[PDB]
Design an enzyme around this catalytic site. Structure first.
Site, PDB file in Angstrom:
ATOM      1  N   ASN A 169     -13.449  -7.232  -8.935  1.00  0.00           N
ATOM      2  CA  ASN A 169     -14.509  -6.819  -8.009  1.00  0.00           C
ATOM      3  C   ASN A 169     -15.790  -7.572  -8.292  1.00  0.00           C
ATOM      4  O   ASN A 169     -16.059  -7.980  -9.453  1.00  0.00           O
ATOM      5  CB  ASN A 169     -14.766  -5.321  -8.093  1.00  0.00           C
ATOM      6  CG  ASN A 169     -13.541  -4.491  -7.737  1.00  0.00           C
ATOM      7  OD1 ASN A 169     -12.551  -4.990  -7.134  1.00  0.00           O
ATOM      8  ND2 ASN A 169     -13.549  -3.246  -8.200  1.00  0.00           N
ATOM      9  N   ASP A 208     -11.788  -1.919   0.497  1.00  0.00           N
ATOM     10  CA  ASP A 208     -10.854  -2.852  -0.055  1.00  0.00           C
ATOM     11  C   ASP A 208     -10.512  -3.892   1.014  1.00  0.00           C
ATOM     12  O   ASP A 208     -11.167  -3.960   2.103  1.00  0.00           O
ATOM     13  CB  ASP A 208      -9.631  -2.144  -0.640  1.00  0.00           C
ATOM     14  CG  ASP A 208      -8.685  -1.580   0.378  1.00  0.00           C
ATOM     15  OD1 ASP A 208      -8.819  -1.788   1.610  1.00  0.00           O
ATOM     16  OD2 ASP A 208      -7.733  -0.884  -0.066  1.00  0.00           O
ATOM     17  N   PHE A 209      -9.548  -4.734   0.713  1.00  0.00           N
ATOM     18  CA  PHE A 209      -9.206  -5.814   1.634  1.00  0.00           C
ATOM     19  C   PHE A 209      -8.159  -5.391   2.632  1.00  0.00           C
ATOM     20  O   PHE A 209      -8.199  -5.819   3.738  1.00  0.00           O
ATOM     21  CB  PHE A 209      -8.743  -7.018   0.853  1.00  0.00           C
ATOM     22  CG  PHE A 209      -9.829  -7.645   0.007  1.00  0.00           C
ATOM     23  CD1 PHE A 209     -10.666  -8.659   0.547  1.00  0.00           C
ATOM     24  CD2 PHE A 209     -10.007  -7.275  -1.312  1.00  0.00           C
ATOM     25  CE1 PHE A 209     -11.639  -9.240  -0.205  1.00  0.00           C
ATOM     26  CE2 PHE A 209     -11.014  -7.841  -2.051  1.00  0.00           C
ATOM     27  CZ  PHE A 209     -11.814  -8.827  -1.503  1.00  0.00           C
ATOM     28  N   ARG A 210      -7.194  -4.581   2.239  1.00  0.00           N
ATOM     29  CA  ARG A 210      -5.977  -4.498   3.026  1.00  0.00           C
ATOM     30  C   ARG A 210      -5.542  -3.083   3.429  1.00  0.00           C
ATOM     31  O   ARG A 210      -4.427  -2.927   3.957  1.00  0.00           O
ATOM     32  CB  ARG A 210      -4.770  -5.142   2.274  1.00  0.00           C
ATOM     33  CG  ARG A 210      -4.880  -6.605   1.812  1.00  0.00           C
ATOM     34  CD  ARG A 210      -4.097  -6.792   0.482  1.00  0.00           C
ATOM     35  NE  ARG A 210      -3.884  -8.189   0.092  1.00  0.00           N
ATOM     36  CZ  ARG A 210      -4.800  -8.990  -0.469  1.00  0.00           C
ATOM     37  NH1 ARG A 210      -6.046  -8.562  -0.746  1.00  0.00           N
ATOM     38  NH2 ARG A 210      -4.458 -10.243  -0.783  1.00  0.00           N
ATOM     39  N   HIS A 265     -13.550 -12.516 -10.767  1.00  0.00           N
ATOM     40  CA  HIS A 265     -13.897 -13.120  -9.477  1.00  0.00           C
ATOM     41  C   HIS A 265     -15.359 -13.304  -9.270  1.00  0.00           C
ATOM     42  O   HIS A 265     -15.795 -13.501  -8.120  1.00  0.00           O
ATOM     43  CB  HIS A 265     -13.314 -12.356  -8.300  1.00  0.00           C
ATOM     44  CG  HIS A 265     -11.830 -12.479  -8.203  1.00  0.00           C
ATOM     45  ND1 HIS A 265     -11.061 -11.684  -7.380  1.00  0.00           N
ATOM     46  CD2 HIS A 265     -10.967 -13.249  -8.894  1.00  0.00           C
ATOM     47  CE1 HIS A 265      -9.787 -11.981  -7.554  1.00  0.00           C
ATOM     48  NE2 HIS A 265      -9.704 -12.944  -8.458  1.00  0.00           N
TER      49      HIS A 265
END
Ligand SMILES: NC(=O)c1ccc[n+]([C@@H]2O[C@H](COP(=O)([O-])OP(=O)(O)OC[C@H]3O[C@@H](n4cnc5c(N)ncnc54)[C@H](O)[C@@H]3O)[C@@H](O)[C@H]2O)c1
Ligand SMILES: NC(=O)[C@H]1CCCc2c1[nH]c1ccc(Cl)cc21
Ligand SMILES: [Cl-]
Ligand code: NA
Ligand SMILES: [Zn+2]
Length: 270
Positions: free
Chosen positions: A108, A35-37, A127
């Site tokens: 995603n 994931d990003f964070r 996205h």
């Protein structure tokens, strides 16, 4: 206060027959895609090698025009083909088999939703996707597979008409939302159940779609944390199953009585 058990009962009874689903990068961490964070493993915290002005730049256009290599290197590592869908994806695939899925909105780019066998018509790839690409200069479109060899060979794909850099149709920061995103206006008022899995609900307008369902509609969040409008604009039929997304999905599947159907599904597909 509704419980996970009450949601399961609604589905079993077909009191909820038009489920809309929102997912993010947390549903793919079990499949080996960061994931990003999240601390430690989140994409934003391991980008030193690329010597960026700041971490988000690797998905921004102006950085991309300055230097496309960092993105393409990362894209090689993320490129679809060998990652597999997990139980989260197969549960969503099972909603569709049982005629319950109105639409699955995904942030995603990993393509795992399609890979799990949910048909494209039920998916909104909010996205974008690796399945197509576009010359960033002349706007000529290409099948995404035509840039795969370049990407896998550490080369920047170039347009054969104009030599401009060709970019997969992933939505970078601040780029236009894809046209299928526009289906949200039709889908959200028809939802009779909303499921949100593995997303921080930080990006707008995506996050706001949680508020776009009728206020009588139960919203079930399956996620490590309580987030977005579920944290800041709660409604009386909200339910949170907090923890690992796979464990959450399994608990639900068990209350639904789908444990053996899932096992059988995940066997056949894998
Ligand atoms: N077009 C765009 O908007 C664009 C472009 C580039 C990047 N991004 C990124 O998209 C992000 C939003 O994406 P997101 O919500 O998909 O991802 P995220 O990484 O922001 O959120 C992931 C969520 O999943 C949880 N999680 C992770 N693994 C889990 C597990 N196994 N079980 C349970 N929970 C788990 C995390 O706690 C978190 O809440 C923005 O932060 C932005 O940086 C967006
Ligand atoms: N699992 C995923 O597909 C996630 C996590 C991997 C990188 C990524 C995801 N979503 C994205 C949306 C836009 C852009 Cl530019 C990148 C990503
Ligand atoms: Cl919010
Ligand atoms: Na919002
Ligand atoms: Zn071109």
């Amino acid at each position: 206060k509704l419980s996970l058990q009450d949601v399961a009962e609604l589905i079993r009874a077909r009191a909820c027959q038009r489920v809309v689903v929102m997912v993010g990068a947390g549903i793919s961490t079990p499949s080996g895609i960061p994931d990003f964070r999240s601390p430690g493993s989140g994409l934003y915290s391991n980008l030193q090698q690329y010597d960026l002005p700041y971490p988000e730049a690797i998905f921004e256009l102006p950085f991309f025009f300055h230097n496309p290599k960092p993105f393409f290197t990362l894209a090689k590592e993320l490129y679809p083909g060998n990652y597999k869908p997990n139980v989260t994806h197969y549960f969503l695939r099972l909603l569709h088999d049982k005629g319950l899925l109105l639409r699955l909105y995904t942030q995603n780019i990993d393509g795992l939703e399609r890979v799990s066998g949910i048909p494209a018509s039920k998916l909104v790839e909010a996205h974008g996707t690796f399945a197509s690409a576009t010359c960033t200069v002349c706007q000529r479109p290409f099948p995404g597979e035509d840039i795969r060899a370049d990407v896998m060979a550490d080369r920047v794909p170039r347009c054969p008409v104009c030599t401009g850099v060709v970019k997969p149709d992933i939505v970078f920061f601040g780029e236009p939302l894809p046209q299928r995103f526009l289906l949200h206006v039709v889908d959200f008022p028809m939802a009779d159940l909303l499921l949100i899995l593995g997303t921080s609900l930080e990006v707008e307008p995506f996050a706001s779609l949680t508020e776009a369902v009728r206020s009588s509609v139960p919203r079930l969040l399956i996620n490590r944390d309580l987030v977005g409008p579920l944290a800041w604009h709660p409604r009386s039929r909200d339910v949170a199953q907090l923890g690992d997304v796979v464990h959450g999905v399994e608990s639900l599947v068990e209350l639904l009585g789908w444990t053996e159907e899932m096992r059988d599904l995940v066997q056949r597909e894998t």
